[PDB]
Amino acid sequence: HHWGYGKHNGPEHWHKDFPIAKGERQSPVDIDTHTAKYDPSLKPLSVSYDQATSLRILNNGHAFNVEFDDSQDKAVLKGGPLDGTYRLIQFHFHWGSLDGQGSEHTVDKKKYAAELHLVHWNTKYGDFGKAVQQPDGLAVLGIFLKVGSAKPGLQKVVDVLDSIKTKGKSADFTNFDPRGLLPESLDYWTYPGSLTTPPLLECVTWIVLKEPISVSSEQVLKFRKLNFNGEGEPEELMVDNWRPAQPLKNRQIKASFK
Numbered sequence: 207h208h209w210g211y212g213k214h215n216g217p218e219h220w221h222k223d224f225p226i227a228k229g230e231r232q233s234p235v236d237i238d239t240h241t242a243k244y245d246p247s248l249k250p251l252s253v254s255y256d257q258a259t260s261l262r263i264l265n266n267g268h269a270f271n272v273e274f275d276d277s278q279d280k281a282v283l284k285g286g287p288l289d290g291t292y293r294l295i296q297f298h299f300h301w302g303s304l305d306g307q308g309s310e311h312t313v314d315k316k317k318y319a320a321e322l323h324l325v326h327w328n329t330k331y332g333d334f335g336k337a338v339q340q341p342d343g344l345a346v347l348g349i350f351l352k353v354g355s356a357k358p359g360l361q362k363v364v365d366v367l368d369s370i371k372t373k374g375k376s377a378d379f380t381n382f383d384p385r386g387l388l389p390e391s392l393d394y395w396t397y398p399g400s401l402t403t404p405p406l407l408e409c410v411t412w413i414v415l416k417e418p419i420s421v422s423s424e425q426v427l428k429f430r431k432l433n434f435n436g437e438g439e440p441e442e443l444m445v446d447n448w449r450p451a452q453p454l455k456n457r458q459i460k461a462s463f464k
């Protein structure tokens with residue numbers, strides 16, 4: 207009836223309705239650290255999230271998204287491998303049923319427990335819908351999450367999950383500061399890719415951070431208690447909402463550090 211991550215509508219079937227799945231610049235991919243080219247001409251990232259306005263949080267049956275007011279240049283990403291300004295529209299996570307899987311990108315075949323995606327769109331295109339029709343319309347900042355110590359800034363997110371347990375539920379989520387989810391260093395790898403969920407459009411410049419953030423076992427436990435199903439339908443726990451690594455093909459992954 208629609209795509210998902212189950213046996214019958216999972217990643218291995220998406221190509222049937224989304225032919226782009228077998229394309230040339232699909233994500234995610236495995237980051238081979240020994241083959242990434244150090245590119246000294248890449249500039250440092252400029253993450254300016256101080257006037258950021260979160261509006262709400264919702265469960266959409268695939269994951270949960272925290273949405274921001276993107277009608278103005280209030281929270282932006284610039285510099286790095288980018289030309290122009292990209293406005294923050296929302297962020298979400300991909301996670302697993304077990305601590306040893308959950309991330310979409312891998313490092314030297316290594317899978318982390320989850321992965322954060324901060325989605326931005328190229329302001330030169332006017333709105334989000336126009337950006338997805340261009341090769342450089344989107345910029346997604348990806349951060350790996352590892353099980354260890356509790357992350358203070360993640361707790362607000364964790365406290366509200368209970369109010370959006372099933373598909374379609376939302377709740378107001380104001381005054382959330384996204385800066386509390388970043389690691390100390392902004393060293394990164396970059397490559398041309400795509401959305402990791404249908405429609406799988408190849409409009410993305412991926413920026414994967416080297417240093418992961420650590421979150422407590424209890425914090426990740428609460429993610430696994432959400433539901434794929436809407437209210438009143440049989441329960442299907444929301445876990446393993448990740449796409450396996452795709453072939454690199456004719457692409458090169460660059461690194462901003464030696």
Ligand SMILES: NS(=O)(=O)c1ccc(F)cc1
Binds near residue numbers: 325346400401402403
């Ligand atoms: N997971 S992701 O590639 O960052 C993604 C971003 C925006 C979407 F609308 C759908 C998927």
Ligand SMILES: [Hg+2]
Binds near residue numbers: 338340343410
């Ligand atoms: Hg595109």
Ligand SMILES: [Zn+2]
Binds near residue numbers: 298299323
């Ligand atoms: Zn994502």
